[PDB]
From a paper:
A [name] [name] variant, present in breast carcinoma, and an R396A variant efficiently hydroxylate NODD, but both manifest loss of CODD activity. Structures of the P317R, R371H and [name] variants with a clinically used inhibitor628 reveal similar overall folds to wt [name], that is, a modified double-stranded-β-helix (DSBH) core (β-strands I–VIII), supporting 2OG and His-X-Asp…His-mediated Fe(II) binding. The structures suggested that these variants probably manifest altered substrate binding, but do not explain how their differing NODD/CODD selectivities arise. Comparison of the structures rationalizes the selectivities of the clinically observed P317R, R371H and [name] variants. In the [name].CODD structure, Arg396PHD2 (α4) is positioned to salt bridge with Asp571CODD; analysis of the ODD structures leads to the prediction that the [name] and R396A substitutions disrupt their interaction with Asp571CODD, but will not directly have an impact on NODD binding. Indeed, structures of [name] with/without NODD indicate how [name] substitution is tolerated for NODD binding. In the case of [name] (which does not hydroxylate CODD efficiently, 2b), both FG2216 and FG4592 manifest NODD displacement less than wt [name].
The ferrous iron and 2-oxoglutarate (2OG)-dependent [name] prolyl hydroxylases (PHDs/EGLNs) catalyse trans-4-prolyl hydroxylations on [name]α subunits, thus promoting their binding to the von Hippel–Lindau protein (VHL), a targeting component of a ubiquitin E3 ligase, and signalling for [name]α degradation under normoxic conditions. The PHD-catalysed hydroxylations of [name]-1α/[name]-2α in higher animals occur in amino- and carboxy-terminal oxygen-dependent degradation domains (NODD and CODD). The three human PHDs exhibit different NODD/CODD selectivities, with PHD3 being substantially more selective for CODD than PHD1/2 (refs 16). Biophysical analyses employing crystallography and NMR reveal that the molecular basis of PHD isoform and variant selectivity involves enzyme–substrate interactions involving β2/β3 loop residues (that bind the LXXLAP motif) and helices α3 and α4, regions which display sequence variations between the PHD isoforms.
Numbering used by the authors:
A (entry chain A), B (entry chain A), C (entry chain A): 182 to 185, 188 to 406, 409 to 414
The structure:
């Protein structure tokens, strides 16, 4: 956990060396309290005004009134009314990555996703062990920003547990307010979200490597590079 | 087989309870004869003016003049010249689904496909056993409208056979004129089209669940949620 | 290796019979020297001005300064400044295919990709054995144009080796200047690029079959045939 808006020093003296050594980097106090609170207010307002999905279907029985649903999501561009501070976070994330370019592995980052805002509703659901990009879709770095004030995992659960490749250990990350996490999106970092027993919010952006994305366009072929005659 | 343009009673008293109990619902006389005949005329005109593909490649030998092809398709938005009544069918299907919303399982339907018009040419080809959505691409309900007047499966074949999960039985559906079929698109309903020995037309729309579709955008990643820096 | 801008005779007397018999067709002197040299100049200028990716990641060790990268690519529409002659090549390829239509197997070609320009940097990397379209994504014909003057595979490597299905033999194709290659994109033609020890350029376009592409839209579902309610 390194310590932070100014961040070139953070990128060059902490994020780049940490990513190249461990593949997992945690920055605490990324935006500061005023800004982090504004983002949390925007995300709660999206939740309270019904902009999230109903949640991943976790258990489906004969009676659909008992169906259990987990993580809820919404995709945010950063330009929508009421999402301007999420947009500021995304710009901040983008400036950090730009300052790392050419220094994160041998990747050359040239694109990203929209922001994926996730809400674990606090009903004991988590997210199963997975790899974000197991099949070469172009995503090289996962970046998550957490929004949960005074989170106490001893009673609320919700820890991100990463299983770094080749090492016999876990890396456990609490989803703390104003924490920014980076990790390699491929099979080097399988991970899971342990059951959350309180409402838990996070915002994820994935960053794309230019070479991997260019050749993915053949595999994930759409109309895309398909055109008329 | 329930019985039908007015249809809120049909949705609430038949379609919703049948889908939640059996996963497979058949509505006969959905649009009535005048309208059903107009749709059939539009589809035959698309066929006769060459708008369908040449058909699924079924057998490919050394000599391509003998290649066997099966089902032919065309994708219809519903706004094209000469497709206005298909467009009316799609609007009718959409109004029905809207009246079911929140009541079909725990799904929240927020999108659909264009209409897939299919023609089995009558040369003994059918469609192999499959699941429509086996990998979580967002499609929750399959809706098929049939256009075949006086169909007699005893001589023309072409029955849809569904293999509902967990039950040791078949559900056999004849592709009858003005019949509308609903079934869950996932692995609950593997199905096949038995060999058709007469020209057989159907129109399919798939309906998307909001949560499943939102998270599919990560799996089926395109430029999509991918954007520039 | 048949012999060539005029080419209807080439399509009808050589390409069509060769593709239907062998699945692999080589045309030498396709555009002639003046035009081929102009294309090579355009491709080298894209390389020299940094328009290619950094190359397929081949070896990734703990230290990313030693990472080995292979083939570099760029996607070209044919209308960009400085790509007009690539655009002429693409138009030439498209006119040839149009003159074959209905005669290549039972396919009906109705679309293509943008041009994929590839550069093997000459560092001993090649491309592993693969099939271009193994899963039914609509691509029926692969068309490659080579740009390498006085290529000598005895010292530079870089041969395309195809492993035609059912036959116990290789088909070895040198990546010669102004050579145009056609082959079926599916599992009939697994192939590899043997290690290249000099800079090696090629331009690939894939051609889509109408039926296979229409039904791929269901499998590779995007927002695509997905639309709002
Ligand atoms: O929230 C966290 O600490 C870690 N979360 C994830 O790893 C995560 N990963 C994916 Cl791929 C999805 C994908 C969809 C919805 C939520 C996700 C999620 O929370
Ligand atoms: O027509 C029928 O009763 C049932 N047909 C299908 O189940 C069906 N399913 C798919 Cl996924 C396709 C897909 C492509 C073309 C035709 C299809 C078809 O008829
Ligand atoms: O260059 C050649 O002779 C043959 N090359 C290929 O077969 C080839 N195939 C694919 Cl699918 C890719 C795909 C991405 C980049 C380069 C490729 C390549 O050179
Ligand atoms: Mn993840
Ligand atoms: Mn089906
Ligand atoms: Mn290839």
């Amino acid at each position: 956990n390194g310590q932070t808006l100014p961040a070139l020093k953070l990128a060059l003296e902490y994020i780049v060396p940490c990513m190249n050594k461990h593949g997992i980097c945690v920055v605490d106090d990324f935006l500061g309290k005023e800004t982090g609170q504004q983002i949390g207010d925007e995300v709660r307002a999206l939740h309270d005004t019904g902009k999230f999905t109903d949640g991943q279907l976790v258990s489906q029985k004969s009676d659909s009134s008992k169906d259990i649903r987990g993580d809820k999501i919404t995709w945010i561009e950063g330009k929508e009314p009421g999402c301007e501070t999420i947009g500021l976070l995304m710009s901040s994330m983008d400036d950090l990555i730009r300052h790392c370019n050419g220094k994160l592995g041998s990747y050359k980052i040239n694109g990203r996703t929209k922001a994926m805002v996730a809400c674990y509703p606090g009903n004991g659901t988590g997210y199963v062990r997975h790899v974000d990009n197991p099949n070469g879709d172009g995503r090289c770095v996962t970046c998550i920003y957490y929004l949960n004030k005074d989170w106490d995992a001893k009673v609320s659960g919700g820890i991100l547990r990463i299983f770094p490749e080749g090492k016999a250990q876990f890396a456990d990350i609490e989803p703390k307010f104003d924490r920014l996490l980076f990790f390699w999106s491929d099979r080097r970092n399988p991970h899971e979200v342990q059951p959350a027993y309180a409402t838990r919010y996070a915002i994820t952006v994935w960053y794309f490597d230019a070479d991997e994305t260019a050749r993915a366009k053949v595999k994930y072929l759409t109309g895309g590079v398909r055109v008329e005659l």
